[PDB]
Homo-oligomer: A and B are copies of this chain.
Amino acid sequence: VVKFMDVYQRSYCHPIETLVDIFQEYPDEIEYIFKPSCVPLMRCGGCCNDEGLECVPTEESNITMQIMRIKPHQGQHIGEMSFLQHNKCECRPK
């Protein structure tokens, strides 16, 4: 049974690993299909417990992953793609 303060601390606005579709980070590349179609990225999430307050980043870094770029019915190559990550988060008014 998870104690009140455990839940509160663990649920409040931090960076958490988050599965993000690549297409949405690079909407311009519709000719392509990617494998995997999504990546694990540290992104702000959780509750501000407060309201119109909002859990946003205040510190970012880029991370570079090896991803398969597929041209359907023609070819496939592993190249490198870079993705935005979130190191610190904060609860800010919107």
Write 23 A-B pairs (CB below 8 A) sorted by A numbering.
A1-B66, A1-B80, A2-B65, A3-B66, A4-B66, A4-B78, A7-B36, A7-B39, A7-B40, A7-B65, A8-B35, A8-B36, A11-B36, A11-B39, A11-B40, A12-B36, A19-B45, A21-B47, A35-B49, A36-B47, A37-B48, A38-B46, A38-B47
- Chain A interface residue number, banded: 20 to 34
Report B-chain residues with C-beta under 8 Å of the C-beta of A3. Answer: 66
Interface residues of chain A, those whose CB is within 8 Å of chain B, are 1-4, 6-8, 10-12, 16-17, 19, 21, 35-40, 45-49, 63-68, 78, 80
Looking at the assembled complex, report how far the CB atom of A35 sits from the nearest CB atom of chain B, in whole angstroms.
6
What is the copy number of this chain in the assembly? 2
- Secondary structure of the A side of the interface? strand
